[PDB]
Amino acid sequence: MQIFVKTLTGKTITLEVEPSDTIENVKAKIQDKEGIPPDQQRLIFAGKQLEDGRTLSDYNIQKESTLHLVLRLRGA
Amino acid sequence: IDDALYSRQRYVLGDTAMQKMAKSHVFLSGMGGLGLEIAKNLVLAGIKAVTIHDTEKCQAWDLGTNFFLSEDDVVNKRNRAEAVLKHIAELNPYVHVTSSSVPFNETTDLSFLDKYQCVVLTEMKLPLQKKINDFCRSQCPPIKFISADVHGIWSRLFCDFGDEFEVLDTTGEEPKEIFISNITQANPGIVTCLENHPHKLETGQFLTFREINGMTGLNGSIQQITVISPFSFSIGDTTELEPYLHGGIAVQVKTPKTVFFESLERQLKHPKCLIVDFSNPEAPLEIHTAMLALDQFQEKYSRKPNVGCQQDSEELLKLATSISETLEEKPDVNADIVHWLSWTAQGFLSPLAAAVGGVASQEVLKAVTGKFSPLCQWLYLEAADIVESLGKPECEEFLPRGDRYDALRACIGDTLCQKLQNLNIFLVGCGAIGCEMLKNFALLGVGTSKEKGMITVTDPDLIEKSNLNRQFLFRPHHIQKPKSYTAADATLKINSQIKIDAHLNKVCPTTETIYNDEFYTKQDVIITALDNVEARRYVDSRCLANLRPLLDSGTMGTKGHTEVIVPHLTESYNSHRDPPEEEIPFSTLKSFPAAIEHTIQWARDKFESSFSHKPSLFNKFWQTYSSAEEVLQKIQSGHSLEGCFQVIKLLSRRPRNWSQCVELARLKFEKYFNHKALQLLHCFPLDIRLKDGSLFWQSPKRPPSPIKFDLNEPLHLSFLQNAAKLYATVYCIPFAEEDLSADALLNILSEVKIQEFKDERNAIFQLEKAILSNEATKSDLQMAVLSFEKDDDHNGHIDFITAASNLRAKMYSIEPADRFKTKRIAGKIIPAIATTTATVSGLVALEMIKVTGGYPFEAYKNCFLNLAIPIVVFTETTEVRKTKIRNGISFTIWDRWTVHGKEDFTLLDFINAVKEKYGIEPTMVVQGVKMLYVPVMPGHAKRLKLTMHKLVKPTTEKKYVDLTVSFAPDIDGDEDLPGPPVRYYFSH
Amino acid sequence: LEEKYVAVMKKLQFDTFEMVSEDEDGKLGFKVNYHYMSQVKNANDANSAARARRLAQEAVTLSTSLPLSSSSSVFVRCDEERLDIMKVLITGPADTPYANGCFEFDVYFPQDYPSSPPLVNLETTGGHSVRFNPNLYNDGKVCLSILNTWHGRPEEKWNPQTSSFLQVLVSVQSLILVAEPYFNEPGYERSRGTPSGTQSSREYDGNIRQATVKWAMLEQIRNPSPCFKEVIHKHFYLKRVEIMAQCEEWIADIQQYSSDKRVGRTMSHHAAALKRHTAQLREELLKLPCP
Ligand SMILES: O=P(O)(O)O[C@H]1[C@H](OP(=O)(O)O)[C@@H](OP(=O)(O)O)[C@H](OP(=O)(O)O)[C@@H](OP(=O)(O)O)[C@H]1OP(=O)(O)O
Numbered sequence A: 001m002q003i004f005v006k007t008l009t010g011k012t013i014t015l016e017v018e019p020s021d022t023i024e025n026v027k028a029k030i031q032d033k034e035g036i037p038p039d040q041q042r043l044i045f046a047g048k049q050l051e052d053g054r055t056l057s058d059y060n061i062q063k064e065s066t067l068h069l070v071l072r073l074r075g076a
Numbered sequence B: 001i002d003d004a005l006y007s008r009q010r011y012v013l014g015d016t017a018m019q020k021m022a023k024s025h026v027f028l029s030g031m032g033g034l035g036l037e038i039a040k041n042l043v044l045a046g047i048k049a050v051t052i053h054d055t056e057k058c059q060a061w062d063l064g065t066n067f068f069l070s071e072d073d074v075v076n077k078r079n080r081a082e083a084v085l086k087h088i089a090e091l092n093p094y095v096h097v098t099s100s101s102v103p104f105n106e107t108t109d110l111s112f113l114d115k116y117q118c119v120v121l122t123e124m125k126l127p128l129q130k131k132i133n134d135f136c137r138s139q140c141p142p143i144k145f146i147s148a149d150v151h152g153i154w155s156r157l158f159c160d161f162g163d164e165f166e167v168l169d170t171t172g173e174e175p176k177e178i179f180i181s182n183i184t185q186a187n188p189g190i191v192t193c194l195e196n197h198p199h200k201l202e203t204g205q206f207l208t209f210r211e212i213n214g215m216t217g218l219n220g221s222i223q224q225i226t227v228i229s230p231f232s233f234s235i236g237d238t239t240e241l242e243p244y245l246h247g248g249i250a251v252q253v254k255t256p257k258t259v260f261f262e263s264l265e266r267q268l269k270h271p272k273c274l275i276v277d278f279s280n281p282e283a284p285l286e287i288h289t290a291m292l293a294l295d296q297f298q299e300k301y302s303r304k305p306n307v308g309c310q311q312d313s314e315e316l317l318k319l320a321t322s323i324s325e326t327l328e329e330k331p332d333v334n335a336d337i338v339h340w341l342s343w344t345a346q347g348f349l350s351p352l353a354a355a356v357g358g359v360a361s362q363e364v365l366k367a368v369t370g371k372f373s374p375l376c377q378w379l380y381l382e383a384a385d386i387v388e389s390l391g392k393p394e395c396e397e398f399l400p401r402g403d404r405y406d407a408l409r410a411c412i413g414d415t416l417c418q419k420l421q422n423l424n425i426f427l428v429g430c431g432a433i434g435c436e437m438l439k440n441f442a443l444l445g446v447g448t449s450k451e452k453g454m455i456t457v458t459d460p461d462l463i464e465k466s467n468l469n470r471q472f473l474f475r476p477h478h479i480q481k482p483k484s485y486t487a488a489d490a491t492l493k494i495n496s497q498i499k500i501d502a503h504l505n506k507v508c509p510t511t512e513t514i515y516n517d518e519f520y521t522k523q524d525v526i527i528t529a530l531d532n533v534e535a536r537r538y539v540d541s542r543c544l545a546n547l548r549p550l551l552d553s554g555t556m557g558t559k560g561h562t563e564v565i566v567p568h569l570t571e572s573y574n575s576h577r578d579p580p581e582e583e584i585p586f587s588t589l590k591s592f593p594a595a596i597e598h599t600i601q602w603a604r605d606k607f608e609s610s611f612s613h614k615p616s617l618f619n620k621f622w623q624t625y626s627s628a629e630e631v632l633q634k635i636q637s638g639h640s641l642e643g644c645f646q647v648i649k650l651l652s653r654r655p656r657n658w659s660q661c662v663e664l665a666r667l668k669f670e671k672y673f674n675h676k677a678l679q680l681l682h683c684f685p686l687d688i689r690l691k692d693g694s695l696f697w698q699s700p701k702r703p704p705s706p707i708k709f710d711l712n713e714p715l716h717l718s719f720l721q722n723a724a725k726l727y728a729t730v731y732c733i734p735f736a737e738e739d740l741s742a743d744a745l746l747n748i749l750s751e752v753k754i755q756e757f758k759d760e761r762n763a764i765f766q767l768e769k770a771i772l773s774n775e776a777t778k779s780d781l782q783m784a785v786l787s788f789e790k791d792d793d794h795n796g797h798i799d800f801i802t803a804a805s806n807l808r809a810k811m812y813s814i815e816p817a818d819r820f821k822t823k824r825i826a827g828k829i830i831p832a833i834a835t836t837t838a839t840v841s842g843l844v845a846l847e848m849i850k851v852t853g854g855y856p857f858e859a860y861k862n863c864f865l866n867l868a869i870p871i872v873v874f875t876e877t878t879e880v881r882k883t884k885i886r887n888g889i890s891f892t893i894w895d896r897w898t899v900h901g902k903e904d905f906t907l908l909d910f911i912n913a914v915k916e917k918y919g920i921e922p923t924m925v926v927q928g929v930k931m932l933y934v935p936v937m938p939g940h941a942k943r944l945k946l947t948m949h950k951l952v953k954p955t956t957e958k959k960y961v962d963l964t965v966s967f968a969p970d971i972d973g974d975e976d977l978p979g980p981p982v983r984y985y986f987s988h
Numbered sequence C: 001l002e003e004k005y006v007a008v009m010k011k012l013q014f015d016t017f018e019m020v021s022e023d024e025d026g027k028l029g030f031k032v033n034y035h036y037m038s039q040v041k042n043a044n045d046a047n048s049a050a051r052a053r054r055l056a057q058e059a060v061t062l063s064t065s066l067p068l069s070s071s072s073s074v075f076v077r078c079d080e081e082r083l084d085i086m087k088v089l090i091t092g093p094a095d096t097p098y099a100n101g102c103f104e105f106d107v108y109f110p111q112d113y114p115s116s117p118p119l120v121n122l123e124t125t126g127g128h129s130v131r132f133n134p135n136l137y138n139d140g141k142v143c144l145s146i147l148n149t150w151h152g153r154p155e156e157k158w159n160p161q162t163s164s165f166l167q168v169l170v171s172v173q174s175l176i177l178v179a180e181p182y183f184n185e186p187g188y189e190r191s192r193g194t195p196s197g198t199q200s201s202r203e204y205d206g207n208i209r210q211a212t213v214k215w216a217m218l219e220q221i222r223n224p225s226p227c228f229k230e231v232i233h234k235h236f237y238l239k240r241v242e243i244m245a246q247c248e249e250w251i252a253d254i255q256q257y258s259s260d261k262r263v264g265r266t267m268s269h270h271a272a273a274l275k276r277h278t279a280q281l282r283e284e285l286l287k288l289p290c291p
């Protein structure tokens, strides 16, 4: 199954996953292409934040679905 | 460009964009709240000329939406455009602002619009907008068109930049740099990146190459790539070229892009809206239909719908149904949206206006400069969640009463308005966001009730010249005054009933005494506008201990975020980690730089070490011991001393006048930029090889080369002048500005020789020589300590740093950097602009109402946005997490256990009490970072027979202390199960 | 002898010492020289709680698993109250130029530990005048992959789940203090086995031997740190004969290359310095009272 991860600043990342995979493994797959540690990344789907310990089937993620990667900022 | 005022903005826009911003005229129509916000943001941005236009007159209803009018203006019935002209021009004296009042109608001659370059329309009937849009887009060149409106809690934005628009920078992110490892003479060729470090590229992008050995034909060319693997990609045919030897650097190339727009009349039948909430992707079309139906109704009846009149709602619903089937996509009709739009058609919500104004100002900047990717083509923001949780309120609660809060009352109702006026709110920091939050509070009437209500704002900093660009509450004649007092005085003018208490403290663990737990208990909501993560974490920990809501926000450039924390519902700030700055590896920084940042960091560290640490050590050492003869005697007796060699060496090489300072600077130049290269080459020759045969001086390492001194080069002269001035300042040697001339330096250096390139007894001899020369007086054992000051243009710090960095870069043959980039990198200045701060402040003000109303968990939202794409993401806040330990016992981060003790309570009694009350027994008690009972370490076995009062050593003001505990795991060899913090009371 | 040395020293590997005392105002006064004073004073935040649990778990391992033998040993001291202050003493292995030395380190655990590796600094630099090893800069910085966070390799970083302080100590002792420190520098291992490499290694070894004889035995005996006074006194008392034999052998070996021309002057200078140091070391050892 094919999914897309669109981060802010327009960069698009292509991922291969299968249902039954676990959110933590899905996010660890991101590191192989970005170097971002799993504990440092938040990913959002359909207005909900994907919690750890769940699987894709629970959130009903299907083929060609889009997930966003977001970060907090420090300036003020 | 006077950098002292636009220092922050240049890092975002750029020199070319700022050049294009000047020589630009903008026409702005409709001086409502939204128009005023747009005008304020544009004037702060720095447009050359702005023309504001309006035809109505001030009314009492306008006081609740405009933060520049006054009672006198309403009494005198002045024109709205004229009454605000004077105050707006005060924001920036470099901007020429003019007012106009020519009537707009169907027969107005639109020929005069060709003078301007962008038109922003607000509070205009739809047919006039259609006509103006038709006229503007047909000019040669076309005139940009932007429309914006706010009705109650619903907003609409529209853009049109002509048939074809050109963008010079799609994303605004700086290109990255990659190192080539291998190339193949194949069709197509295959390029393999270095080990690790994925290229992070995508198909279709363009690259250029340089510094390649063997494949010299590829140097300076441009290729289009096709990603194959995370560590490799492909380029064009290379079979006809020489074999690849080694080396190579590829850097991404930016490419202009062309986008297409459509006229307003055509877009009304199938808009290309932008999705902001992916839970309801179909909402924007329904909102568009509802707004169009409202416009048709207003045209038909020449009035807006009255609140509570059901026939108006039925008519509006029928109009919406008629319109919807005519649309190309044929969507459904949302009854709830139409109902609420009818209910609050005559209201006005200030924070939504602020957010829309910020977005519109960013769009105007995009239109005039072409810097970023423009919006295409609609945007529909709304705050329905505020009223969705009210249920079915009565119509009487929304009727106007005849004061300045009529608009807000018509928006949200009387009860929520009254609950707003009794808030006690604590605001941390008074930066760019703080002023906007204060303005929004003043407009909302927060804390204006006589009986209850207060606003507390704390900030220790003072007003600076560069701060006036973003913070509009400050004025040029306010420099070097506390921020909090000025902000309070400015805010009191907007609303006379506001009660603000201002402080000058900095929220930190040292000042915890004044901000005790009773103070936090008194407050109702805490808002932060900080700029560092340590303060954010400390404030979050403090709020977590008293169950108080927290609202947090931050911006950097064109990106921003907001977060909401509510007790018993959501996780705290500390539940997520933040990315720290990556450290440069020590060898790369010290000996093998490969980019300009490494040289800049080296120069900064050299400045710190040479002018701060060493003088401090010298002063401390010579204040530890009274006399130099005493030190000499102690040395002669074999007594060891700490840092004696360094301080005695500094004493021996102490200059005495200006000429010796110049000579010292020359020697420092030689030592820094000549001998290091020779030593490094001597240790590692250019042809040395590793085990596998690869040359040692391969990428990313760059071989160095010595630099010969020459006074004609400006760089050498600048370095010499700055170093001489700094050394003279440190050693307290008087000097005059005439001595800094090139001729004087040439005369001084004409008799100075340069040594060629190749302990206790020496130190004793040098100290004795200093003793016999009467050089050890009290005045000689003193050196001034300097501090880094990046905002001063005459101390010479930045000049020295830039000169050193550029010299070291040329030593390693790297491209130099100018003064401003060096200043930004050295000072770690965060780029900022007014639009993003206004937007995030509006969103935070929106969320504050939901926090006040006590809405359920599903109402709160978090926003992550990047206006450069543009892209906005609304998500639900993180739900609380259950954590268990044993026996089915579970706890959340908001839990806290309590144990009541007495005067003779012992540690064993504490353990037994916890075990009996909660069912499990602790195995380690630690107070903060100071341990109290750990069985492993020696001597703690006997601590079980001690009084807790002695064992804690508390302060009499506090009646309780907080402790952390841990519990033994079920299976040995595993980490102890964490537990909730436990609060211990000394007595009943 | 080795059994007696092991038996005596096993009771001193782990203990606690009083380093920081607090007054009524909460100010901190250090009774011993500490390299990270400023960070301790500035970082007063008590938000960290997982650090306490991690250190409490580690103290279980540190009380029994520290290496201990006649060749090399490790000693650790920690504050009576705080948990983020430690001092480490490591004795140089045998058959190396660092033989029978006493090297002292300073360790500080940051607030966000174990998310970040602890900071380690060398203190036996002889006033920053000596570079003891390619990985031990003369300013005191110890450079290792496990203590750094950079691109590198995923298995060559401080991994919060698996990496531990004991690994840091063992890595330092096993990888930094080796038989031939000259070849730790990459780029030199190509010339291994060549006469030029052998000559350079001999010069480096002579310099390191004289440096350690000066700043690792004599100075430690004369001005021991208060934390490790008893350990040092009992360590040098029990191994005086071996130290004398080793010093005599080192003096004998260096002079074998005094007749060379390329490195003869350096070897002669090193031999003179070593003789001067040994002359005073003999008197210092002879006057050492029995513990
Ligand atoms: O104190 P630091 O900032 O670490 O700089 C020192 C210092 O150079 P300066 O005092 O000229 O800045 C050393 O000189 P001394 O004061 O100790 O005599 C010098 O040592 P050398 O004179 O022996 O070269 C050493 O350079 P190195 O470590 O290469 O020996 C160099 O360090 P950096 O310039 O790399 O900081």
Ligand SMILES: *P(=O)(O)OC[C@H]1O[C@@H](n2cnc3c(N)ncnc32)[C@H](O)[C@@H]1O
Pocket (backbone or CB within 6 Å): A075, A076, B428, B429, B430, B431, B432, B433, B458, B459, B460, B461, B483, B505, B506, B507, B508, B529, B530, B531, B532, B535
């Ligand atoms: P931005 O940098 O524009 O504004 C931030 C302002 O907040 C103040 N500030 C920073 N850190 C603190 C703490 N801990 N307490 C109170 N105020 C703080 C800065 O001085 C800026 O004025």
